[PDB]
Amino acid sequence: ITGTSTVGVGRGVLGDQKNINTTYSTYYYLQDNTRGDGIFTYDAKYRTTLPGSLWADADNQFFASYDAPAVDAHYYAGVTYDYYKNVHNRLSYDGNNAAIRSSVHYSQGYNNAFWNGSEMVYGDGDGQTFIPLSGGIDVVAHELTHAVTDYTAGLIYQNESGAINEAISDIFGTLVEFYANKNPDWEIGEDVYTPGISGDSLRSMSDPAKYGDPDHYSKRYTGTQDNGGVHINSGIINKAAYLISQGGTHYGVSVVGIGRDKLGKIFYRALTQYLTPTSNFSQLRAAAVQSATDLYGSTSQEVASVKQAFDAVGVK
Ligand SMILES: *CC(=O)N(O)[C@H](CC(C)C)C(=O)OC
Ligand SMILES: [Ca+2]
Ligand SMILES: [Ca+2]
Ligand SMILES: [Ca+2]
Ligand SMILES: [Ca+2]
Ligand SMILES: [Zn+2]
């Protein structure tokens, strides 16, 4: 849409008030002109047909309960872009300021979100397992990070390279949640998962085993479901990433933590420079060590913490 950039206010899924960037042209649209080639949010109207309608509002005020998921998808897509640009110098998911598109209210009681190759899609949940998925900043950044991976390493969605794909999403969605200082933690989807249960999450980075995910290479899932456990085996990597950043002793192997900033820097460098579509866990180790070496020197503590970490999780 062509119009005048303006700023609206709304309430998110969690009931929090925020300003969003909008465009005025008879109606007020959920189109943000300030970021790259724009951030566009659509209404899928409980159907599966994408992207749906560009979100239009009569008064620039988004306080209706139907508005909730749109506010958040729009806003959190903004923060995600900001993180990439500010922290890693990357303009949008393609590095060329490509427009970011999101559709909310996808299907009925749909318990998931996804990057479909060209845009993000967000179900509303069934109201018990999940509430509208775009209310989790880590969920929004996990998904957009799949766009980043597609344009860089291109990790195939299956077996070890898909577990890596999943882990990078989890890593960068956590980094974005810390970046925004939105009650940060090392958990995935805690804000939108099981509105009746407190203190749970979909996956843990600090302790993947809490939910039954492997925290060691010897415990890796060798089957068929979940594209060969792309969401299961990612826990081996998430654990490794957690240890590099925070430190700890895991299975008798001690890791000195080097912090989240440096973790983000080594991982982004591995993703953009060393990983390929077919990379396996052992190639991720090599890619991380080499990124750490490039940045900090072969004899750095950084390099030493990356090796420990992988050693702690049984990767090589
Ligand atoms: C959204 C996506 O690509 N996924 O893989 C999601 C992530 C959660 C919504 C965080 C998923 O974990 O599906 C099982
Ligand atoms: Ca309104
Ligand atoms: Ca949190
Ligand atoms: Ca989290
Ligand atoms: Ca819960
Ligand atoms: Zn994912």
Same domain, 110 and 182: no
Question: Cα–chain-centroid distance for residue 25?
Answer: 32
The enclosing domain of 207 has a CATH number of: 1.10.390.10
Residues with CB under 5 Å of ion ligand 4 are 138, 177, 185, 187
Question: Position 129: which residue type?
Answer: T
Residue located nearest, by CA, to atom 10 of ligand 1: 139
Which of 128, 154, 180 is where one domain is finished? 154
| Distance (Å, whole) CA 96 – CA 35 | 11
Residues assigned a catalytic role: 143, 231
Q: How far is the CA of 199 from the centre of ligand 3 (A)?
A: 11
Residue 180 Rama label (left phi>0; alpha psi -120 to 50; beta): alpha
Single out the residue in 132, 154, 176 at which a domain terminates: 154
**Burial level of 197, CB count in 10 A (0-12/13-18/19+)?**
exposed
State which amino acid sits at residue 135: G
8 A C-beta contact, residue 255 and residue 245: no
**Residues lining ligand 1, judged by CB closer than 6 Å?**
112-115, 133, 139, 142-143, 146, 188-189, 202, 231
User: Minimal CA–CA distance to 230: which of 183, 184, 281?
Assistant: 281
Cβ neighbors of 126 (< 8 A, separation 6 or more) are 109, 111
Residue-number span of the structural domain to which 49 is assigned: 6-154
10 CA distance to ligand 2 middle (Å): 8
CATH number for the domain harbouring residue 50 = 3.10.170.10
Residue 36 DSSP class: T
Residue 252 falls in which region: left (phi positive, over 0), alpha (psi -120 to 50) or beta = left
* 63 Cβ neighbours under 8 A, 6+ residues apart: 10, 11
Asked if residue 167 and residue 129 are part of one domain, the reply reads no
> How far is 11 from 142, CA to CA, in rounded Å?
22
Judge contact between 62 and 10, C-beta under 8 A.
yes
- Distance (Å) from CA 292 to ligand 2 centroid: 49
Specify the number of domains making up the chain. Answer: 2
